[PDB]
Amino acid sequence: HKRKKVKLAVLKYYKISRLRRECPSDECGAGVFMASHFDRHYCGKCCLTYCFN
Amino acid sequence: VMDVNTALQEVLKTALIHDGLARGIREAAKALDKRQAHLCVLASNCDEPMYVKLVEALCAEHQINLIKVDDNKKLGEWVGLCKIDREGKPRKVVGCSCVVVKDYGKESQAKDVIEEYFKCKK
Ligand SMILES: [Zn+2]
Numbered sequence: 816h817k818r819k820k821v822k823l824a825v826l827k828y829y830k831i832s833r834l835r836r837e838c839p840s841d842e843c844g845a846g847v848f849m850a851s852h853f854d855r856h857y858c859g860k861c862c863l864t865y866c867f868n
Numbered sequence: 869v870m871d872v873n874t875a876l877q878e879v880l881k882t883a884l885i886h887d888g889l890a891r892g893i894r895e896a897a898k899a900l901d902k903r904q905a906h907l908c909v910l911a912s913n914c915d916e917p918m919y920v921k922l923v924e925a926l927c928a929e930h931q932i933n934l935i936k937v938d939d940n941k942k943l944g945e946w947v948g949l950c951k952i953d954r955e956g957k958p959r960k961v962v963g964c965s966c967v968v969v970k971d972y973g974k975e976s977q978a979k980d981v982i983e984e985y986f987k988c989k990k
Contacts, residue, residue, distance in 0.1 A: 825893075825916070825918070825919070826893065826894055826897065827918065829922055829925070829926070830925070831925050831926065831929055845901050845902060845903075846897065846898035846899075846900075846901035846902050847898065
């Protein structure tokens with residue numbers, strides 16, 4: 816078996832009130848959004864993984 | 869007469885050939901947030917209300933000039949994501965709702981959008 820990537824209809828991170836945070840990095844930021852998992856935060860292109868308990 | 873339609877075609881082609889055209893909504897989002905925009909235009913033929921509303925809010929945030937095109941497919945043809953197919957009329961056109969000009973690229977007849985800016989200012 817191989818992984819079949821799942822598709823999402825649209826992006827809804829906004830309402831201007833953002834609904835996710837942004838990767839504090841030199842290369843990227845203010846427009847790239849950090850994944851909000853059930854426990855941690857994680858930035859896709861850079862791998863910054865702000866864990867929070 | 870040099871109207872905003874022909875001048876819009878001109879500036880969009882010139883943005884494309886100098887690789888300063890961000891087509892889509894995700895690219896339009898990150899480009900608009902990065903404050904690297906010069907112009908934005910959205911299509912009237914969008915049934916989704918959240919798309920148009922989001923584009924209005926995001927463009928209103930930095931107060932950039934706004935144009936309409938009234939046809940998703942026409943705007944897709946203009947921005948250039950199509951195959952010519954040996955003729956002026958192309959096939960399998962992909963709809964493009966929003967597109968943001970990252971860079972004008974070449975300053976040829978760039979004044980016309982600013983002329984239209986004054987026309988809205990009036
Ligand atoms: Zn990052």
